[PDB]
Design a protein around this ligand. Structure first.
Ligand SMILES: Cc1ncc(C[n+]2csc(CCOP(=O)(O)OP(=O)(O)O)c2C)c(N)n1
Ligand SMILES: Cc1ncc(C[n+]2csc(CCOP(=O)(O)OP(=O)(O)O)c2C)c(N)n1
Ligand SMILES: Cc1ncc(C[n+]2csc(CCOP(=O)(O)OP(=O)(O)O)c2C)c(N)n1
Ligand SMILES: [Mg+2]
Ligand SMILES: [Mg+2]
Ligand SMILES: [Mg+2]
Lengths: 554, 554, 554
């Protein structure tokens, strides 16, 4: 009859439909550990709260569902800050449950109390709030969850004082509410939908560009019905990429990064339909080399701030990307008489094919194994059954170069935050999600980036998570080392040389299979063996440093 | 050639379609003032920055558009804080432009530099930001507008460093963007709309409650259509009242407070459609006193946090209220199978009118003018051409008891901030935008409340503003004095008596028409008089302090 | 045995030895009004929270002590923000007690509850905190007072949830701490002090300048002794001026502002002892206009950031300004051989006098009363027995030129916030402090500035506070009309016309003495009268607007 506040937290999460938590133990949050123990709710405990946070993100991104991070007071929270800020810029839905000092003995210079965690999380969350009463728990947890899931998606900080968590209340007294929130999003007004549809019908070279908000709602089947009736090519930023994985092969434009050299071939797009993709790092900023200044733009985004923020656009809609896609598939259904778009699809296909073949031709692997070739080795293993997690600068923009012509189940790369090393936690969490859906996760990170959360090879072994960490090891902080040469001068490389350490040796110590390879065939075989067993694996890949990825030259 | 920084602000402001500004001069923001002079943009300078801010609220609330406040650095910003906070809770679209310390001479103990205005506004604005370059002025102003205008509506702070406002850049060299925002709001997915309408037709005692967002979109025409086909009674909070004035009297429940008396007749609502109406102060929180616990709630709100925050709901939709009404009215043109809804309208009408007569039965005027009698002198004077601004606690609680059966063009009362003294600023700015149409504005304020921004008669006189101020005088801070008596005891009154000044004299010293009143007819002559004229009118009214409103009880 | 939290607040305030509170009533803080009324502790209830806030500062500033401000939740707090912001920059000790939403019913959209008040006050307070338990009140109240009273003095916000105040505890169980905090500030290291005196002895034309922190510790006899033994000329800024009032007039250098000419009189100070004076708006900024580069500087300040913030200095001491003056006095009391500065002092006295008369010779009042003439009339009513509070920009820039070489009991003015209208609240609270002091308070304010808190005439009459409200009336915003001519064009003035309202009529309408005067004959008669009458009085003074006050030369 008497239950702890920590019980209420878990019961509300049970009701909300959560089946996994990612975290690190603390006395302050043990009531939640105890309650999860009782209801068989697995907490995937890590070796760093940053890894736990990133794992909640990874789980959310690869699962298209809610992520839950569980951290303790003080350092527990501060260690989760990078995942918080990363989820913020990436529009990913994570509930960050955090402990704090007890309200009784507030301002007593005590263990793990003393820092305004709500004030700290404020600038980088949709909502950050501290619970003031134990009976408020179910309603406030449910409130926090609604905030995170609705467009635009984002992180929420729920601060649960040790006080409030240890408190015992009569269970029959406080009501645990249901998650009452519509799964379908808000659609555009039929007038703007009639307009956007009209504007794209009379169009010589139209393109769709998908963003993160497309993957959250993940309304794939509707995207098919819409793309089939209209026959319009679809591009995406890294986060939208996997949404193209189910499109008929002809209208798969790939990553928006290659809407770039459309300038030399007349191919400057006529009308661009942006669906949750923002103006910034991912779409060539305002520099307009990706989204051409002379194109008419139709932008759909949950936040009006994003509506033509860097370039003057034509039609500015504010609705949910998911509902918007649904509204487009619904209208496009009976309107089944659409213009001839055979030879714009071929152009988009052929221009991306060009840039690809062009780089393959300039890629030599004599004396040193080329990053491009090691990228093609992973690429040959990429279908809907595989999630790919990208980390590590030079690593990921070489990886980006092969990623457009395969159909990944998921693809989790860096957002605007671009925090080197977020990939390990992300991939761990993604592997937990992919286990339910019968899929495999592969992290592709740099030698420098992996050392951020290298202790997570332990967690992979302890929890038996079959993640294959692939390390592009060019003995350095790659992209930065290039900046020191290309931007400063040839012999001005300081603090970027990382010429020490056997990474497979580290993985071997934590009990995970370590491979160090240095050639195409050996790496190809190592990866094949890694996939072949259901066990965590490190593949230390000795790779070339000197070559320059095309993205860097821009 | 060269144009100033503030010169850019004003140009970007007119392309937005705004026609007025409310402010106070600062030598930090004269750059705006001068650019405004030669575009014939009227800056209505008040006598207190607080007043200007509330006037920006009024303007935006009265004419359902965007309001603009324009304050000087340091002290100018901090004086606008209450307006900003009020706007935040009331969900009203206002663009607060503030000057600040020049980036040159930053951190130098300078004149009006050295305070973090953005940090101060961030907890109470949808967006708070400081412009770093002069060329950024247009894209960020237009951005701030987009933020202020989308659902849910709310205030935005744009900090313009005096530095940035003075720097001249080539007039051709930076584009001045159009405001591209769909105006038509996003609407619920049809499946939810079906779920809603199916439950609505199933209901035996259905009800609709309107909140601020209905008034911000002001789709009176679509609402009427929807209300007609279905024949469901409609209620509202103070902010959603204007939106009942254009509907058939048969389906007009009035203010939500009237839903209180219903449980005493086994006539408690069966199902309630909350359109932008939040669970909180105005809807009786989660007590189940207005919105019954046994009733099945459908809630439509732009903020997912609001979806069942204090009470379990049956269906929760995140979509724009204005778009939702549009959809509900549209789904209506093909239904044509709705119940008579006449005998429930009978019940709703009977209960409302019954409550009204019940107060008239209790109210005596034999020794002092009953606030309710004095309130009626205003009621038979209220139509679609009057805008009523309510301030003062005891004043507005009594004044509401009549407002349900009359129908104003504008009704602006307190929100959650409950800030006594906002009424004058709100009223002043309501007169503009009542000058915009042909409507005339009446303010009904308490004797203590008016002292807050009493120096605004100087503005009313200077700027030829026909506003009538009805000072409800009970010689005290009424409701607070009632608190002291009812909550602690009869002889426990302190700091709540106000038995001194001649307010109607005060206004006359500023050169405005000042009146007096003892009883019912005494006031009619003063009211019909000053209303017959077309200029600033200050009326004083001696009124009984003793009587407790029905809203006070409970 | 059972007492409320509000009672705990009051008993703690009493034990700290506070005698007055300044505020505006709300039901959220009534428990504090009830306790105060029980212990005979006056709450000066005003007509605006800003006036209550400012009165708390004025009390603190005029009486060299703590000022306590009492405001209610929501609107009450937001209205006190400008005072908080002002006390911040002016380094004035004010405890701001605010009510807020109850902790039970957090996040309920309830009345006056939903603004993060601590987050708002955070940028502009030494400390801002929200009480979480009723038992914590005494220790937290006392903690706040320590924070405010210690160098550098500043404002503090204690947020007191309605919940926590209404709550009842066994009075026997909670202890009420003493205010144990030393009255003596920390003095410099002897090696630092000796090298300061080693420089002062071995220097040719040395000068002392005082700041805010010098009035906060208000050490007259120690400073008096130090200046007697050393014979060094002493200046000060606006807040420091009142400390010169007790020195030998041969040392009284007046306002450091007079120090411009030393640059072009060849006698620029060869050494400057900055005692709390800050490198900013008060002291020629960073440029050597008031503080020459050629001068070697010894600076004392509680804040190390201030130590040569914008200039190079020879010695930087973090210590209490009052404690230092004591170390200066004590050590210098043995040194019986301080070099004579009679020659240097004579030069200084005669340069301040040369400045004075050169202003006096012109400025003829042959048509209108040159504000200099209006200021000199006030001057012959100024001595140790009078506190002069000052407002209005164009107003004060004349008054400063006459204040130098007449000795006020207190001289309160604008700090770095420079907010117009702060003067009324300030004088209202100062008068309270001056009434126990036996002094008389005169407020000299501009015509626009007075409109801010014009209802406070009701306060002056209700509370019977015989403040004299002088209005220097030039029917305009003066300095901001000035700027519009001088920096734009003589025909480019908009939004500064205040040619309206007999300000003296409104004050008379609130039941105080009302006078309008124009010439020295009419004026010094209205003044002489309003003085002899021990009652609140308003002296409206029609004045020339055209004349430039000399402090503007660049
Ligand atoms: C957390 C973090 N630290 C530092 C940086 C700056 N940075 C950008 S690229 C880069 C080099 C990454 O090198 P590596 O992980 O080895 O991958 P590589 O480029 O060699 O393929 C660094 C340190 C960053 N973006 N994030
Ligand atoms: C800014 C602000 N200050 C104080 C309060 C507390 N308060 C609530 S009601 C009230 C009385 C208002 O009196 P008046 O304006 O004369 O109207 P009346 O109640 O007498 O009709 C006060 C001071 C508040 N709600 N907001
Ligand atoms: C809150 C605020 N509003 C406006 C200003 C800008 N300002 C500087 S001087 C000035 C003139 C005010 O002087 P006034 O009260 O009219 O008396 P005067 O200077 O003419 O003698 C104004 C409005 C400010 N600093 N702070
Ligand atoms: Mg590397
Ligand atoms: Mg009243
Ligand atoms: Mg003036």
């Amino acid at each position: 009859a008497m239950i702890t506040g920590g019980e209420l937290v878990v019961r509300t999460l049970i009701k909300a439909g959560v089946e996994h938590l990612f975290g690190l133990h603390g006395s302050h949050i043990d009531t939640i550990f105890q309650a999860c123990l009782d209801h068989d709710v697995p907490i995937i405990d890590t070796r760093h709260e940053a890894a736990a946070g990133h794992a909640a993100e990874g789980y959310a991104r690869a699962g298209a569902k809610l992520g839950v991070a569980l951290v303790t007071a003080g350092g527990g929270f501060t260690n989760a800050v990078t995942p918080i800020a990363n989820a913020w810029l990436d529009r990913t839905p994570v509930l960050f449950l955090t402990g704090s000092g007890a309200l009784r003995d507030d301002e007593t210079n005590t263990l793990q109390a003393g820092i305004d965690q709500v004030a700290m999380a404020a600038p980088i969350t949709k909502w950050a709030h501290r619970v003031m009463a134990t009976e408020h728990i179910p309603r406030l947890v449910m409130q926090a969850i609604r905030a995170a899931l609705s467009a635009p998606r984002g992180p929420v900080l729920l601060d649960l004082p040790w006080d409030i968590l240890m408190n015992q209340i009569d269970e029959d007294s406080v009501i645990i509410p249901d998650l009452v929130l519509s799964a379908h999003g808000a659609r555009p007004d039929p007038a703007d939908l009639d307009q956007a549809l009209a504007l794209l019908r009379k169009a010589e070279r139209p393109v769709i560009v998908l963003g993160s908000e497309a993957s959250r709602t993940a309304r794939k089947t509707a995207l098919s019905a819409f793309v089939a009736a209209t026959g319009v090519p679809v591009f995406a930023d890294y986060e939208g990429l996997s949404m193209l994985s189910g499109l008929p092969d002809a209208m798969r434009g790939g990553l928006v990064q290659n809407l770039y050299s459309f300038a030399k071939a007349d191919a400057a797009p006529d009308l661009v339909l942006m669906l949750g993709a923002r103006f910034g790092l991912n779409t060539g900023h305002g520099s307009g080399q990706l989204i051409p200044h002379s194109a008419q733009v139709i932008q759909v985004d949950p936040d009006a701030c994003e509506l033509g923020r860097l370039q003057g656009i034509a039609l500015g809609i504010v609705a949910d990307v998911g509902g918007t896609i649904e509204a487009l598939a619904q209208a496009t259904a009976q309107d089944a008489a659409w213009p001839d778009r055979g030879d714009w699809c071929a152009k988009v296909t052929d221009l991306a094919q060009e840039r690809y073949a062009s780089i393959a031709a300039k890629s030599s692997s004599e004396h040193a194994l080329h990053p491009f070739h090691a990228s093609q080795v992973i690429a040959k293993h990429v279908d809907a059954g595989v999630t790919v997690v990208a980390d590590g600068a030079l690593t990921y923009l070489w990886l980006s170069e092969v990623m457009s012509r395969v159909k990944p189940g998921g693809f989790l790369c860096h957002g605007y935050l671009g925090s080197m090393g977020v990939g390990f936690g992300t991939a761990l969490g993604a592997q937990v999600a992919d286990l339910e859906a019968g899929r495999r996760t592969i992290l592709v990170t740099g030698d420098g980036s992996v050392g951020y959360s290298i202790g997570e090879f332990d967690t992979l072994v302890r929890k038996q998570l079959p993640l294959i960490v692939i390390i592009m090891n060019n003995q350095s902080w790659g992209a930065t080392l290039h900046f020191q040469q290309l931007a400063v001068g040839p012999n001005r490389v300081t603090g970027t040389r990382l010429e020490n350490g056997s990474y497979h040796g580290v993985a071997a110590a934590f009990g995970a299979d370590g491979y160090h390879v240095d050639s195409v065939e050996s790496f190809s075989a190592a990866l094949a063996q890694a996939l072949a067993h259901n066990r965590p694996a490190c593949i230390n890949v000795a790779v070339a440093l000197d070559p320059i990825p095309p993205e860097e030259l821009i």
